[PDB]
Design an enzyme around this catalytic site. Sequence first.
Site, PDB file in Angstrom:
ATOM      1  N   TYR A 104       0.810  -1.202   0.000  1.00  0.00           N
ATOM      2  CA  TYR A 104       0.000   0.000   0.000  1.00  0.00           C
ATOM      3  C   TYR A 104       0.832   1.235   0.000  1.00  0.00           C
ATOM      4  O   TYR A 104       2.000   1.214   0.417  1.00  0.00           O
ATOM      5  CB  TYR A 104      -0.936   0.037   1.229  1.00  0.00           C
ATOM      6  CG  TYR A 104      -0.224   0.303   2.556  1.00  0.00           C
ATOM      7  CD1 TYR A 104       0.008   1.615   3.003  1.00  0.00           C
ATOM      8  CD2 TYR A 104       0.226  -0.750   3.350  1.00  0.00           C
ATOM      9  CE1 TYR A 104       0.667   1.860   4.194  1.00  0.00           C
ATOM     10  CE2 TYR A 104       0.880  -0.519   4.561  1.00  0.00           C
ATOM     11  CZ  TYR A 104       1.097   0.776   4.977  1.00  0.00           C
ATOM     12  OH  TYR A 104       1.744   1.002   6.156  1.00  0.00           O
TER      13      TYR A 104
ATOM     14  N   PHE B  80       2.201   9.878   3.230  1.00  0.00           N
ATOM     15  CA  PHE B  80       2.516   9.647   4.679  1.00  0.00           C
ATOM     16  C   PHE B  80       3.151   8.276   4.954  1.00  0.00           C
ATOM     17  O   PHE B  80       3.876   8.127   5.943  1.00  0.00           O
ATOM     18  CB  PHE B  80       1.306   9.913   5.636  1.00  0.00           C
ATOM     19  CG  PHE B  80       0.055   9.090   5.352  1.00  0.00           C
ATOM     20  CD1 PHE B  80      -0.071   7.785   5.825  1.00  0.00           C
ATOM     21  CD2 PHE B  80      -1.009   9.650   4.637  1.00  0.00           C
ATOM     22  CE1 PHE B  80      -1.222   7.045   5.571  1.00  0.00           C
ATOM     23  CE2 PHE B  80      -2.154   8.928   4.384  1.00  0.00           C
ATOM     24  CZ  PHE B  80      -2.269   7.619   4.848  1.00  0.00           C
ATOM     25  N   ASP B  81       2.895   7.285   4.098  1.00  0.00           N
ATOM     26  CA  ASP B  81       3.473   5.953   4.285  1.00  0.00           C
ATOM     27  C   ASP B  81       3.407   5.110   3.013  1.00  0.00           C
ATOM     28  O   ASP B  81       2.547   5.314   2.164  1.00  0.00           O
ATOM     29  CB  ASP B  81       2.744   5.205   5.441  1.00  0.00           C
ATOM     30  CG  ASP B  81       3.506   3.957   5.935  1.00  0.00           C
ATOM     31  OD1 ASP B  81       4.679   3.745   5.550  1.00  0.00           O
ATOM     32  OD2 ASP B  81       2.920   3.170   6.721  1.00  0.00           O
TER      33      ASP B  81
ATOM     34  N   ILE C 287      -8.112   0.487  10.149  1.00  0.00           N
ATOM     35  CA  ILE C 287      -9.169   1.514  10.058  1.00  0.00           C
ATOM     36  C   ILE C 287     -10.375   0.955   9.242  1.00  0.00           C
ATOM     37  O   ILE C 287     -10.205   0.098   8.345  1.00  0.00           O
ATOM     38  CB  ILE C 287      -8.635   2.861   9.507  1.00  0.00           C
ATOM     39  CG1 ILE C 287      -7.905   2.692   8.158  1.00  0.00           C
ATOM     40  CG2 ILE C 287      -7.706   3.533  10.550  1.00  0.00           C
ATOM     41  CD1 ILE C 287      -7.455   4.020   7.550  1.00  0.00           C
TER      42      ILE C 287
ATOM     43  N   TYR D 258      -9.009   8.004  10.911  1.00  0.00           N
ATOM     44  CA  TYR D 258      -8.536   8.380  12.271  1.00  0.00           C
ATOM     45  C   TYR D 258      -9.387   9.450  12.955  1.00  0.00           C
ATOM     46  O   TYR D 258      -9.013   9.964  14.017  1.00  0.00           O
ATOM     47  CB  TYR D 258      -7.049   8.798  12.206  1.00  0.00           C
ATOM     48  CG  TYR D 258      -6.201   7.641  11.746  1.00  0.00           C
ATOM     49  CD1 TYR D 258      -5.818   6.641  12.646  1.00  0.00           C
ATOM     50  CD2 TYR D 258      -5.803   7.511  10.417  1.00  0.00           C
ATOM     51  CE1 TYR D 258      -5.050   5.548  12.235  1.00  0.00           C
ATOM     52  CE2 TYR D 258      -5.024   6.410   9.999  1.00  0.00           C
ATOM     53  CZ  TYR D 258      -4.658   5.437  10.934  1.00  0.00           C
ATOM     54  OH  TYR D 258      -3.909   4.339  10.592  1.00  0.00           O
TER      55      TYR D 258
ATOM     56  N   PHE E 183      -5.635   5.867  -0.173  1.00  0.00           N
ATOM     57  CA  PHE E 183      -4.713   4.745  -0.261  1.00  0.00           C
ATOM     58  C   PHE E 183      -4.809   4.085  -1.607  1.00  0.00           C
ATOM     59  O   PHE E 183      -5.903   4.027  -2.193  1.00  0.00           O
ATOM     60  CB  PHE E 183      -5.036   3.670   0.773  1.00  0.00           C
ATOM     61  CG  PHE E 183      -4.724   4.048   2.189  1.00  0.00           C
ATOM     62  CD1 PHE E 183      -5.654   4.712   2.959  1.00  0.00           C
ATOM     63  CD2 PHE E 183      -3.505   3.696   2.771  1.00  0.00           C
ATOM     64  CE1 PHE E 183      -5.386   5.048   4.288  1.00  0.00           C
ATOM     65  CE2 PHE E 183      -3.223   4.031   4.109  1.00  0.00           C
ATOM     66  CZ  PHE E 183      -4.168   4.705   4.863  1.00  0.00           C
TER      67      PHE E 183
HETATM   68  C1  FK5 Z   1       0.964  -2.262  17.906  1.00  0.00           C
HETATM   69  C2  FK5 Z   1       1.274  -1.257  17.126  1.00  0.00           C
HETATM   70  C3  FK5 Z   1       2.126  -1.411  15.895  1.00  0.00           C
HETATM   71  C4  FK5 Z   1       1.251  -1.863  14.741  1.00  0.00           C
HETATM   72  C5  FK5 Z   1       1.956  -1.587  13.432  1.00  0.00           C
HETATM   73  C6  FK5 Z   1       1.997  -2.464  12.414  1.00  0.00           C
HETATM   74  C7  FK5 Z   1       1.359  -3.823  12.458  1.00  0.00           C
HETATM   75  C8  FK5 Z   1       2.711  -2.084  11.154  1.00  0.00           C
HETATM   76  C9  FK5 Z   1       1.710  -1.469  10.157  1.00  0.00           C
HETATM   77  C10 FK5 Z   1       2.265  -1.621   8.729  1.00  0.00           C
HETATM   78  C11 FK5 Z   1       1.312   0.012  10.481  1.00  0.00           C
HETATM   79  C12 FK5 Z   1       2.329   1.078  10.014  1.00  0.00           C
HETATM   80  O1  FK5 Z   1       3.565   0.971  10.725  1.00  0.00           O
HETATM   81  C13 FK5 Z   1       4.703   1.457   9.977  1.00  0.00           C
HETATM   82  C14 FK5 Z   1       1.804   2.537  10.130  1.00  0.00           C
HETATM   83  O2  FK5 Z   1       0.788   2.653   9.150  1.00  0.00           O
HETATM   84  C15 FK5 Z   1       0.305   3.950   8.864  1.00  0.00           C
HETATM   85  O3  FK5 Z   1       1.340   4.818   8.369  1.00  0.00           O
HETATM   86  C16 FK5 Z   1      -0.699   3.698   7.744  1.00  0.00           C
HETATM   87  O4  FK5 Z   1      -0.357   3.832   6.573  1.00  0.00           O
HETATM   88  C17 FK5 Z   1      -2.085   3.297   8.004  1.00  0.00           C
HETATM   89  O5  FK5 Z   1      -2.898   4.212   8.094  1.00  0.00           O
HETATM   90  N1  FK5 Z   1      -2.419   1.979   8.104  1.00  0.00           N
HETATM   91  C18 FK5 Z   1      -1.541   0.781   7.968  1.00  0.00           C
HETATM   92  C19 FK5 Z   1      -2.056  -0.058   6.828  1.00  0.00           C
HETATM   93  C20 FK5 Z   1      -3.437  -0.544   7.173  1.00  0.00           C
HETATM   94  C21 FK5 Z   1      -4.334   0.651   7.327  1.00  0.00           C
HETATM   95  C22 FK5 Z   1      -3.874   1.646   8.381  1.00  0.00           C
HETATM   96  C23 FK5 Z   1      -4.172   1.113   9.752  1.00  0.00           C
HETATM   97  O6  FK5 Z   1      -5.326   0.804  10.008  1.00  0.00           O
HETATM   98  O7  FK5 Z   1      -3.104   0.986  10.724  1.00  0.00           O
HETATM   99  C24 FK5 Z   1      -3.430   0.442  12.002  1.00  0.00           C
HETATM  100  C25 FK5 Z   1      -3.609   1.563  12.965  1.00  0.00           C
HETATM  101  C26 FK5 Z   1      -2.447   2.515  13.174  1.00  0.00           C
HETATM  102  C27 FK5 Z   1      -4.809   1.654  13.619  1.00  0.00           C
HETATM  103  C28 FK5 Z   1      -5.148   2.716  14.636  1.00  0.00           C
HETATM  104  C29 FK5 Z   1      -4.890   2.085  15.997  1.00  0.00           C
HETATM  105  C30 FK5 Z   1      -5.343   2.961  17.143  1.00  0.00           C
HETATM  106  C31 FK5 Z   1      -6.770   3.497  17.011  1.00  0.00           C
HETATM  107  O8  FK5 Z   1      -6.885   4.549  17.962  1.00  0.00           O
HETATM  108  C32 FK5 Z   1      -7.098   4.057  15.632  1.00  0.00           C
HETATM  109  O9  FK5 Z   1      -8.526   4.201  15.547  1.00  0.00           O
HETATM  110  C33 FK5 Z   1      -9.001   5.023  14.464  1.00  0.00           C
HETATM  111  C34 FK5 Z   1      -6.597   3.175  14.479  1.00  0.00           C
HETATM  112  C35 FK5 Z   1      -2.301  -0.511  12.432  1.00  0.00           C
HETATM  113  C36 FK5 Z   1      -2.187  -1.600  11.392  1.00  0.00           C
HETATM  114  C37 FK5 Z   1      -2.482  -1.114  13.842  1.00  0.00           C
HETATM  115  O10 FK5 Z   1      -3.628  -1.959  13.846  1.00  0.00           O
HETATM  116  C38 FK5 Z   1      -1.299  -1.960  14.348  1.00  0.00           C
HETATM  117  C39 FK5 Z   1      -0.078  -1.142  14.683  1.00  0.00           C
HETATM  118  O11 FK5 Z   1      -0.158   0.059  14.897  1.00  0.00           O
HETATM  119  C40 FK5 Z   1      -0.259   4.568  10.155  1.00  0.00           C
HETATM  120  C41 FK5 Z   1      -0.707   5.996   9.894  1.00  0.00           C
HETATM  121  C42 FK5 Z   1       0.756   4.450  11.333  1.00  0.00           C
HETATM  122  C43 FK5 Z   1       1.225   2.988  11.490  1.00  0.00           C
HETATM  123  O12 FK5 Z   1       2.202   2.817  12.524  1.00  0.00           O
HETATM  124  C44 FK5 Z   1       1.679   2.906  13.852  1.00  0.00           C
END
Ligand code: FK5
Lengths: 113, 113
Positions: free
Chosen positions: B33, B43-44, B63, B89, B106
């Site tokens: 992605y 952003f990523d 998300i 978010y 995305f």
């Molecule tokens: C245990 C923690 C480490 C664990 C990290 C990984 C497995 C590595 C994984 C590639 C994430 C990336 O790590 C480089 C990085 O991806 C982003 O850059 C991004 O592109 C993004 O948007 N993604 C990731 C791709 C799926 C969609 C989305 C997401 O849904 O991500 C989810 C997310 C952040 C959800 C929040 C969680 C908190 C709630 O409050 C909020 O509720 C609205 C939603 C991720 C998958 C979490 O489930 C699990 C984690 O965080 C974020 C901008 C910041 C994030 O790093 C933190």
Amino acid sequence: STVVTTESGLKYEDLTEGSGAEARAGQTVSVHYTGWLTDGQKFDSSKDRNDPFAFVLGGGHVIKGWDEGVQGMKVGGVRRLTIPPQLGYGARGAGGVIPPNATLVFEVELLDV
Amino acid sequence: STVVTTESGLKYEDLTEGSGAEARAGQTVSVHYTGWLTDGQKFDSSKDRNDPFAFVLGGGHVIKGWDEGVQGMKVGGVRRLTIPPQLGYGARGAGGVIPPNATLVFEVELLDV
Ligand SMILES: C=CC[C@@H]1/C=C(\C)C[C@H](C)C[C@H](OC)[C@H]2O[C@@](O)(C(=O)C(=O)N3CCCC[C@H]3C(=O)O[C@H](/C(C)=C/[C@@H]3CC[C@@H](O)[C@H](OC)C3)[C@H](C)[C@@H](O)CC1=O)[C@H](C)C[C@@H]2OC
Ligand SMILES: C=CC[C@@H]1/C=C(\C)C[C@H](C)C[C@H](OC)[C@H]2O[C@@](O)(C(=O)C(=O)N3CCCC[C@H]3C(=O)O[C@H](/C(C)=C/[C@@H]3CC[C@@H](O)[C@H](OC)C3)[C@H](C)[C@@H](O)CC1=O)[C@H](C)C[C@@H]2OC
Ligand SMILES: [Ca+2]
Ligand SMILES: [Ca+2]
């Protein structure tokens, strides 16, 4: 390359060392594999279905030899596992594919962790 | 290609239709992605880390826009998701990467199911 025999009786050999991230218990890993019986008969390959196999490393959803043997691989790595029957399908085998009490040979290619 | 707007406000567009197996809720899927803000700031990207992203489709660990949006993709397909903030978010955003009330774009490439 060396052959390692673990306490469980598993044997493994890194045919190629991976340059990527290390596989640890807890991670969801993706692999290609091929399986053979000790007579050289191939019984399965994920490459034949063009379908990588995913599982939770140490999750207890693969035979014991796999859960133990895939740990420590690096992404890009190819590891050969020789799995004695108590870490495979044991006395039961796997109906129509793996006989009772079989040692199994797998080649595993780590695609991602 | 056409753009579909769902009951949730999610928009998706298949930039390329996949030729392999269909992504269904329940499956563990692997993707590459890239994520952008609506002003084109990236952003990523999983491609930059050389690290495919695995998740359980419909498992509630991504998300809401992803859990909904990736369903129906076929392996090899590239789908663009435009995710309003209530399926992203929301008002919190995500510290130093995604601001409050951000619409997210995305591009998702389905690698395996
Ligand atoms: C245990 C923690 C480490 C664990 C990290 C990984 C497995 C590595 C994984 C590639 C994430 C990336 O790590 C480089 C990085 O991806 C982003 O850059 C991004 O592109 C993004 O948007 N993604 C990731 C791709 C799926 C969609 C989305 C997401 O849904 O991500 C989810 C997310 C952040 C959800 C929040 C969680 C908190 C709630 O409050 C909020 O509720 C609205 C939603 C991720 C998958 C979490 O489930 C699990 C984690 O965080 C974020 C901008 C910041 C994030 O790093 C933190
Ligand atoms: C719901 C069921 C479908 C589900 C199927 C898949 C996810 C697709 C997946 C690619 C399996 C292959 O399907 C093409 C096919 O792979 C084999 O050919 C094979 O190479 C093999 O040995 N593998 C697969 C690769 C991981 C190691 C090992 C295994 O651990 O397999 C596990 C296995 C069978 C464990 C038994 C389970 C019963 C216990 O009694 C026994 O206890 C001793 C151990 C598999 C992963 C199970 O957890 C889950 C499943 O079965 C088997 C010879 C037969 C098997 O088809 C069924
Ligand atoms: Ca697969
Ligand atoms: Ca990964």
